[PDB]
Amino acid sequence: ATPAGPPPKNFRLPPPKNWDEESESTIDKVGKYFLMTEMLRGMYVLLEQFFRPPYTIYYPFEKGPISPRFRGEH
């Protein structure tokens, strides 16, 4: 599963950290749970799209781009 020869330098993972060894303040950790902050960020990204121009083409009045090499009817 690893190549022959010496194992990769630090291929083995570090030992797992216990819950109280983690570096995340309870205030930051508990706030992100109850306020649902990462879900709030994603909802904000959809507001950003809302106020951006759409990609839509009005067909059949506006056509999409075709190259000189296009392969249509004989």
Ligand X SMILES: CCCCCCCCCCCCCCCCCC(=O)OC[C@H](COP(=O)(O)OCCN)OC(=O)CCCCCCCCCCCCCCCCC
Listed in order, strand segments (DSSP E) in the chain are: none
Contacts (CB under 8 A) with other proteins, residues 24-63: 26, 29-30, 33-34
Task: Copy the structure tokens of residue 17.
Answer: 């950290």
One residue of 4, 10, 15, 18 binding other proteins per CB under 8 A: 18
57 contact partners, CB below 8 Å, separation of at least 6: 63, 64
- Using alpha carbons, select from 49, 47, 65 the residue that is nearest to residue 57: 65
Tell me: does residue 44 bind ligand X (CB under 6 A): no
Closest separation in Å from C-beta 39 to ligand X: 6
Site string for ligand X, 22-41 (x = CB under 6 A): -----------xx-x-----
